[PDB]
Design a protein around this ligand. Structure first.
Ligand SMILES: *C/C=C1/C(=C/c2[nH]c(/C=C3[NH+]=C(/C=C4\NC(=O)C(C=C)=C4C)C(C)=C\3CCC(=O)O)c(CCC(=O)O)c2C)NC(=O)[C@H]1C
Length: 313
């Protein structure tokens, strides 16, 4: 079972207890976006990432306690309709806000219990691609070809320096079984790794929340304020928030591997984590929301295609 998070006096994680880190409730986010939580009935803004002004242009003391009716008058009625209390946690509301001065902000919202979790990120245009990518996966005649096509297709869509298919064995060790990578980079094909490098609670989370990333492996996490949800005096669930701060153990692993940006998408087969599409860039690199949506759709397709193929064998 999970340790309490650090801000509730839980132990700091070492290689003796990798699996006990409550990675879903870090109480902090990555600084390339901003996050608010709001009461799912009143729309009262309950928590804000400390960088909320970088993205929203508001007075911090003014942000907290303001309602979404006042802050986002156009979107609030849409949110009430799209994410009513009792709706599935998997539902997402997305909108583009045109009012920010630097450029458009992309808003992603999901509900966890009585909380709306609002994620704000800069908009960025990105180059039919999804349909062709899906067809490429479907056209692969066997699992080996499917792995090859998946890595190639994801690399083409993203421009990541390295895209791997990381496959789990029954003992939860992992192996890179397919790869597409930048010219002149060493291969990771055939490399095998202990189960602890993607520990059991991470693998469980990844069976439910299918994409996660670290946009900048040297960027300090930005606290939520207050860190505890005022509704509960308990941690805010961030497992479904792409902006969730990454485990420091994993941040360090990535930096030691020469990785500046990391992203993976789950391959889930029979409710089990079959593997990951695991991506690296050597520098920081922020993929925009619409491209992440494309990758999520491809992960679901890859999962379905692995499942169909393994069934027919
Ligand atoms: C003692 C704890 C440690 C630890 C825990 C840990 N690891 C993750 C997440 C990931 N680890 C990954 C591992 C690899 N990526 C690679 O490219 C390779 C080999 C080529 C390996 C072995 C991967 C892919 C992930 C998924 C996240 C991502 O794609 O970037 C977590 C959870 C991270 C999070 O979601 O917050 C944790 C807690 N890692 C260790 O190495 C040991 C020391």
């Amino acid at each position: 079972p999970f340790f309490p998070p650090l801000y509730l006096g839980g132990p700091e994680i070492t290689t003796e207890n990798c699996e006990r880190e409550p990675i879903h409730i870090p109480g902090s986010i990555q600084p390339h976006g901003a996050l608010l939580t709001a009461d799912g009935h009143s729309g009262e803004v309950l928590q804000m990432s400390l960088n909320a002004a970088t993205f929203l242009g508001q007075e911090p003391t003014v942000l907290r306690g303001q309602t979404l009716a006042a802050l986002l008058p156009e979107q609030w009625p849409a949110l009430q309709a799209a994410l009513p209390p009792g709706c599935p946690d998997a539902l997402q509301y997305r909108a583009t806000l045109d009012w920010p001065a630097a450029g458009h902000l992309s808003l992603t919202v999901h509900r966890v219990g009585e909380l709306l979790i609002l994620e704000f990120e800069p908009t960025e245009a990105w180059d039919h691609a999804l349909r062709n990518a899906m067809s490429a996966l479907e056209s692969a005649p066997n699992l080996r070809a499917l792995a090859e096509v998946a890595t190639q297709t994801v690399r083409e869509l993203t421009g990541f320096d390295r895209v791997m298919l990381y496959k789990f064995a029954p003992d939860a060790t992992g192996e890179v079984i397919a790869e597409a990578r930048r010219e002149g980079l060493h291969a990771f094909l055939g490399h095998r790794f202990p189960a602890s490098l993607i520990p059991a609670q991470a693998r469980a989370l990844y069976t439910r929340h299918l994409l996660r990333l670290t946009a900048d492996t040297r960027a300090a996490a930005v606290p939520l304020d207050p860190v505890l949800n005022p509704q509960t005096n308990a941690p805010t669930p961030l497992g479904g928030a792409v902006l969730r701060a990454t485990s420091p153990m994993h941040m360090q692993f990535l930096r030691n591997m020469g990785v500046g940006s990391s992203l993976s998408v789950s391959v889930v087969v029979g409710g089990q984590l079959w593997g990951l599409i695991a991506c690296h860039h050597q520098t920081p690199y922020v993929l925009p929301p619409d491209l992440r949506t494309t990758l999520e759709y491809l992960g679901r397709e890859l999962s379905e295609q692995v499942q169909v193929k393994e069934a027919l064998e």
